[PDB]
């Protein structure tokens, strides 16, 4: 996961409002969350990977071991069960709650970190560059 390690800044966001709609995020949270230009800080210490997001909307931090389910309270306040695995270089993060599931994929592409958020038929692409 060393290629992911670093401080990253959001530079573009496509279809994020529609992704959040599909997830079930309410109007006011969608509007405020949609404006944010977060920094994502990724670090590794042994088997533990930490992903921190710092933004004007709200700060989050998750630490996890690959393949091992954990509790996550998301920025939009869902209480989800999360599992993150590595699939041929891509971090695959599945969140489950209320009989629903969404998948967030994080991958390195050129000098960018590309985040693909999928909820049923709706995909949002968020691109980060090194801070």
From Swiss-Prot:
Q: Which residues carry this modification: Phosphoserine?
A: 12
Q: Which SUPFAM superfamilies match?
A: Lipocalins
Question: What are the UniProt keywords, alphabetically?
Answer: Acetylation, Cytoplasm, Lipid-binding, Nucleus, Phosphoprotein, Transport
Q: Which residues carry this modification: N-acetylcysteine?
A: 1
Single GO MF descriptor: fatty acid binding
Please give the biological process terms from Gene Ontology that the record holds.
brown fat cell differentiation; cellular response to lithium ion; cellular response to tumor necrosis factor; cholesterol homeostasis; fatty acid transport; long-chain fatty acid transport; negative regulation of DNA-templated transcription; positive regulation of cold-induced thermogenesis
> InterPro entries this protein is in?
Calycin, Fatty_acid-bd, ILBP, Lipocln_cytosolic_FA-bd_dom
The record ties this protein, via Gene3D superfamilies, to: 2.40.128.20
> Where are the Phosphotyrosine modifications?
19
Q: Which residues are noted in the entry as a fatty acid-binding?
A: 126-128
The UniProt entry's GO CC annotations, sorted and at most eight, read:
cytoplasm; cytosol; extracellular exosome; lipid droplet; nucleus
Instruction: Report motif location: Nuclear localization signal.
Output: 21-31
Carries keyword Transport? Answer: yes
State the signal peptide span: none
Location of this chain's protein in the cell: Cytoplasm; Nucleus
Highest taxon in the source lineage: Eukaryota
Per the record, the domain comment is:
Forms a beta-barrel structure that accommodates hydrophobic ligands in its interior.
Report the sequence similarity comment from the record.
Belongs to the calycin superfamily. Fatty-acid binding protein (FABP) family.
Quaternary structure (record): Monomer. Homodimer. Interacts with PPARG.
Q: What does this protein do?
A: Lipid transport protein in adipocytes. Binds both long chain fatty acids and retinoic acid. Delivers long-chain fatty acids and retinoic acid to their cognate receptors in the nucleus.
Q: What is this protein called?
A: Fatty acid-binding protein, adipocyte
Q: Provide the organism lineage as a comma list.
A: Eukaryota, Metazoa, Chordata, Craniata, Vertebrata
């Amino acid at each position: 996961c060393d290629a992911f390690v670093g401080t990253w800044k959001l530079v573009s966001s496509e279809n994020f409002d529609d992704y959040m709609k599909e997830v079930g995020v309410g109007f006011a949270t969608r509007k405020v969350a949609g404006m944010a230009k977060p920094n994502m800080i990724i670090s590794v210490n042994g088997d533990v990977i930490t992903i921190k997001s710092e933004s004007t909307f709200k700060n989050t931090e998750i630490s996890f071991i690959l393949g091992q389910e954990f509790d996550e309270v998301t920025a939009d306040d869902r209480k989800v069960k999360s599992t993150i695995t590595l699939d041929g270089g891509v971090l695959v993060h599945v969140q489950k709650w209320d009989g629903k599931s969404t998948t967030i994929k994080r991958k390195r592409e050129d000098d960018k970190l590309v985040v693909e958020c999928v909820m049923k038929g709706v995909t949002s692409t968020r691109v980060y560059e090194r801070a």
